[PDB]
Paper text:
[name] is the structural precursor protein in [name]-1. It is a polyprotein synthesized from the unspliced viral mRNA, and is cleaved by the viral protease (PR) during the maturation stage of the replicative cycle into 6 proteins and peptides: matrix (MA), capsid (CA), spacer peptide 1 (SP1), nucleocapsid (NC), spacer peptide 2 (SP2) and p61. The CA and SP1 region multimerizes forming the immature viral lattice, comprised of interconnected hexamers. SP1, together with the last eight residues of CA, have been hypothesized to form a six-helix bundle responsible for the higher-order multimerization of [name] necessary for [name] particle assembly.
The [name]ΔMAT8I construct lacks most of the globular domain of MA (residues 15 to 100) and p6. We, therefore, purified [name]ΔMAT8I assemblies directly from lysed bacterial cells. Upon iterative refinement, the final density maps of the [name] hexamer from [name]ΔMAT8I assemblies in the absence and presence of IP6 and GagT8I VLPs were obtained at 4.2 Å, 4.2 Å and 4.5 Å resolution, respectively. The SP1 helix in the [name]ΔMAT8I map is complete and extends to the SP1 and NC interface, therefore allowing model building of the C-terminal portion of SP1, from T8I to M14. Intriguingly, we observed a strong density above the six-helix bundle. This density is coordinated by two lysine rings formed by residues K158 and K227 (K290 and K359 in [name] amino acid numbering) near the bottom of the CACTD and above the bundle. Considering that [name]ΔMAT8I assemblies were produced in E. coli cells, it seems unlikely that the density in [name]ΔMAT8I map is IP6 (left). When the same [name]ΔMAT8I assembly is incubated with a buffer containing 10 μM IP6, this internal density is present at lower position resembling that seen in GagT8I VLPs. It is plausible that a small anionic molecule other than IP6 assists in the charge neutralization of the lysine rings and promoted assembly in E. coli-expressed [name]ΔMAT8I. Radial density profiles from three different particles of similar size displayed three distinct peaks corresponding to the CANTD, CACTD and NC-RNA density layers. While CANTD, CACTD and SP1 are rigidly connected as seen in the [name]ΔMAT8I map, NC-RNA is flexibly linked to SP1, resulting in a smeared density in [name]ΔMAT8I subtomogram averages.
Numbering used by the authors:
A (entry chain I), B (entry chain D), C (entry chain E), D (entry chain O), E (entry chain J): 146 to 378
The structure:
Amino acid sequence: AISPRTLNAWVKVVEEKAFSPEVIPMFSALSEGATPQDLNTMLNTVGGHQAAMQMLKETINEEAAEWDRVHPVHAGPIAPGQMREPRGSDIAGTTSTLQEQIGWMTNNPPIPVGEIYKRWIILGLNKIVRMYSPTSILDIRQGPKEPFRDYVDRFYKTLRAEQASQEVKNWMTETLLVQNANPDCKTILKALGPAATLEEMMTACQGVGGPGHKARVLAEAMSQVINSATIMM
Amino acid sequence: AISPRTLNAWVKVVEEKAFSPEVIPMFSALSEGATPQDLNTMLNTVGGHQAAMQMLKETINEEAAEWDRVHPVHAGPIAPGQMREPRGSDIAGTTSTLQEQIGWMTNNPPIPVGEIYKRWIILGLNKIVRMYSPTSILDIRQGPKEPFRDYVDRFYKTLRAEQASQEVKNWMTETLLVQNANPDCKTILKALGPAATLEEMMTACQGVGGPGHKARVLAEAMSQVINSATIMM
Amino acid sequence: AISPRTLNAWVKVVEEKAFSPEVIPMFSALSEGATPQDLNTMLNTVGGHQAAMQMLKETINEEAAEWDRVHPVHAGPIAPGQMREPRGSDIAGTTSTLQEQIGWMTNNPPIPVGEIYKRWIILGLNKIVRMYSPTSILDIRQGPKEPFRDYVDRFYKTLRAEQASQEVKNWMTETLLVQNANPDCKTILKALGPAATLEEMMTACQGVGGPGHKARVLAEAMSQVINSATIMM
Amino acid sequence: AISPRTLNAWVKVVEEKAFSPEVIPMFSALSEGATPQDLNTMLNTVGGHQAAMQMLKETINEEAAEWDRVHPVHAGPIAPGQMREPRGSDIAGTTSTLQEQIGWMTNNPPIPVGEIYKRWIILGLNKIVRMYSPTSILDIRQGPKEPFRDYVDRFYKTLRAEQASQEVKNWMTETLLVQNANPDCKTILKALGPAATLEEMMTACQGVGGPGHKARVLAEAMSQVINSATIMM
Amino acid sequence: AISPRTLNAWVKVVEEKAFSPEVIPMFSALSEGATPQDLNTMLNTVGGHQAAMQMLKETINEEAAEWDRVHPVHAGPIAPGQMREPRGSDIAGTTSTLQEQIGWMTNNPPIPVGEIYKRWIILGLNKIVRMYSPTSILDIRQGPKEPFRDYVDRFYKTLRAEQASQEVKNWMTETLLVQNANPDCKTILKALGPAATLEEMMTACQGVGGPGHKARVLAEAMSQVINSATIMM
C-alpha cells in the first residue's frame, strides 16, 4: 500500500499549483510501483477541479475501451487458476479486488497492469494539461452590460472556492471587488467613500443600466458639449 | 482504521482555517472511535504550524506523566495473557502495537484507551487555541529603523509559507510589499513609478538610514523652516 | 551498481542549476532501480549547499521514524533466514550492508526498499524546493549603515564559493563590488578614479559612518541650503 | 509491447515543443518498463530534427563502447542456455531479437538491460538539451550584404519544415518575409504597395547590392549634404 | 578501485580551472597507485574541452605505438600462465580486463603497467598545457565587418558552455554583449536606451554594413567637413 503522508503531499501539490506541464513528474515519482486500486484511490482524492476530472475519467474509459478492442476474451476451459487475462474493464480496477490485483502482480509472468494503468493516467493528465485554463479570483471582471448585483454574486460564488486563509479573503474582498468594476458603476461606487458596506454599495449602483440612469449620463454628456457649443455664441 | 479521505478533509480544515475555538468539534467528529495509533497518525500529518505542535506534544507528554504518576505498575505473577494495564507511555501509542491496541479495545472490560488519548488531545488543542496568534502575510510591516533589504527578505521568507495559488502570490507581491513600507522609504520608492522591479527598488532605498540620507532629510526640514523664518525678514 | 559518469552528470546538474521545481525528474531518471546504499552515496556526493542538506536529512529521518511507528518489529522464532522485515533505521541504509540489501531486493517477494527510499527522498527534495531561496554573488549589497570593510569581507567570503572560472571572478570583483556600494561611500569611492586597488579604496571609505564624516556631510547640506537662504538677502 | 496511442502522444509532445529541460520526465514516464527494442522504436519515430539525432545516436554508441570496455566477454564452455551476458552492442538492441530480449528480462536474476538503455538515452537527451538551440521561422533575417533572391529562397526553404496548418503559413508568408528585410531593400520593397506578388517584388529588389544601385544611393546622400552645404552660400 | 568522491573532486578541479602548468601535481596525487583501467575511466569522465582531448588521446596512442616498436612480441611455447608481457595496445587498457590487469600488478615481478600509463598521460597533459589557450565568454568580440546577428549567435553559442549559475548568466548577457560590440553598431545600439530587448536591438543594427547605412555615415562625415569648409567662405 501507500503511506498516508505521501497521498497528502501529492494532493497538496495538486491543489497548491495551477494546471502546469510538470505535474506528471511528481505524479509518476510519488505513485511508484503502486497498485491500480491505490492509483484510483489517489485519483478520486483530488478536491475540487471536478471539471477536468470529467475529461480525465473520459480518456481513461476510452483507453479501456481500446484495450478491450485489442485483446480477446477467449480463454478456457482450464480449471480455475490464474482465471483470465486482465480486462480493460478491470485494469482500471472497477470490477476487481485487491486480492485479484495481487494475484496478477506477484504471479509469473508479472503482467504489470498497474504500470499500464499508470501509462493511461499519464496520457490523460497530459491531455488535461493541454485542454485546461486555470481560473482565479483575479480574472473575475464585470461585463460591460451586467447587473452589478449579479456581478457581486458571481464574485463571492467563485471566491468561496479560493484556497486561502481567512484574513486574506477579507482584504481580497475589500480591494479587488470594487477595483474591478466597470467605469460606469465605478464612477459612482468610488465617489461614495470606501467606508460603506456591500449593502450601501449595492443600493448605490442598483440604478445603473436603467433608463433613468442612461438619461442622466446622456444629458451630462450633451450639456458638456453645448457648454462650448455656446462659449462662441 | 480510518479512510484516507477523512484524514484529507480534516487536514484541509486545519490548514484552511486559522487557530479558532471551533476546531475541537470537527476534530472529535471526524476522529470518532478511532484507535490511538490512528490519532497520532492524524496528528503528525498536519503540515506547517510546527510551532504550536511543540506545545501540543508537550501537553500530551505532561498528561502522560501524570497518568503514570496516578497508576501503579504493580502486576503479576499471572502467566502472560492481557499482560499489563496500559501505561501513560503507551496510551499515547509510543511503545505499543496496533495488535496490542486491539487486544486492549476489544477485550472485556473495554478500557477505552483511545477515548482517554482523545480527551488529552482535546485538552491540548484547547490550550493551544488559547496560547496562539495566527500570523499572516498581511501583518508583516517594516520596522521604523530597519534595513529595507532585510524587510523584503522577511517578506518573501514568510510569503513562501502562505497557502495560496500562483497568481494570487504575484499580485500580492506587487501590492502589499510596497504599500506597507515606512514613510521614509515609501516617499522615495513611490516617487519612482510602479514599473521598476525589485532590483531597482532595492538599489533606490539602499541609502535610507545612512548618514548621507539623514543629512539630506534634516537639511530639507531646516530649509523649509528658514524659508519662512525669512519671509518676514 | 551505478556508473561513475552518471553520478558525475547528475551532480553536474545539481551544482550547475539553482533550486528549481524540475530537479526531481532528472533525479528519478538517473537514479533508476538503484540500491539504497547507492542512493545515499548519490546524496552525500553533493558539494556545498549543506544548508538545505540539513533539512533534507531531517525529512528523511522523520519519514524513517514514521515508518518505524507504523511497522512492528515482532518476528520469530524462525531460524535465521530472511531474518527480519526492513526497518526505518536500515531502509535508509544506516545499519545494513549491500549484501543484506541484495538479500532484500532479489528475494521473493521483492520488497522494493530502494523504491521506498526513493519516494522519501523525492518528498524531501520537493519540500526543499519549496523552502529554499538561491543566493548569488549578484545580490550581495551594502547595508545602509555598515562598515565598508565588513562589506568587502562578506563580498569575498561568499565570492569564494561562487562556481566559475578564474578570469570571470577577476572582472566580477572589478565591476560589481564598487557598483553595489551605498551612495555615501560610492560618491567618494567613485571620485577616486578606477585605477586604485582595494587597499587604497579601503583607506578611502574608512571614514564613512564616523562623526567627522557625518559632520562634513551635514555641513555641506546646510551650506547648500544657506547659499540661497541668502541669494535673496 | 507499447500501445500505439502512447507513442503518438509522446511524439506529439516532441514535435510540439522546442528543446527544453523537461522532456526527460515525460519520456521516462511514457517509456515505462518497456523493452529496449521498443525504446529504439520510440527513438527513430521522431520526425525531423535529425541534426540532434546525430549527437544522440553518438552518445548512445559511446556509452555502448564504454560498457563493452568495462565488461569482459569471457564465458563458457557451458552448453547453450542463457548463452552469454548482454553486450554493449546488443543492449542497444542492434544484434539481438525480441525473443532474446525477453529471455533476458524474465530470467532470474532479471538483468534490467532495458533500464540501462533507458539510463543511457536519458543521459543523451540531457546532453542534447544542453547542446541545442531551436530554430524558428521567426529568426530568419536578411544578412546585411545578401542577394534578396537567396534570402527568399532560404525563407521558404526553412518555412516548408514549419509545423503549422495551411492558412497560418499563408499569412506568415505575407507578413514576416517583407517585414524582416534589410532597410536597403525594405525602403524600395515597401514603397511599392503591398498588393504586388513575390515575382514583382523579386524584380524590384533585384538591383540592390549592384554598382548602379550603390551609385544611386551615394548620390542621394551627397546631394542631401550639398543642399545645405549651399543654403549658406 | 578509486572512491567516487576522489574522481568528483579531481574533475571539479579540472572544470573549475583553465589549462595551467600545475594540473599534473593534483592529477598524480589523486591518481595514486591506481589501475590503468581506472585511469582511463578518470580520463573520459572529463566534460567538455574535447578539443584538447583529441591531442591527448593522440599522444597516448603515439607512445603506445612507440612502446610497441621497442618491445618484441616473441613468446612461447610455454603453457598458458602469465601468458605474455603487456602490449602498447593493452597497457592503455584497450584490449585487457581488470582481471588481467591484476594478474599483472600483483604477480612477481610487479611490472608497473599502471605507472607507465601514468607516465604517458603526464607527458600528454604537459604537451596539452603547452599547446592550449583557454577560451572565455570575456574574449568574444565583434569582428570589424561582421553581421551583428551572427555576432549574437556566436555569443550565445559559446555562452551556453560557460560554467556558472543562472543569474550570473543573465547579468552577463545584459552587460558584456552590448558593451563589446563594434563602435559602428554601438553608436546606434547605445542611443536606443538600455530597456529594449534583444529583438528590438537586432532590428536596430540590422542595417549596419549595408549600402544605405554606409551612405548615411559617409554623408555625415562629409557634411561635418563641409560645415567648416564653408565657415570661411
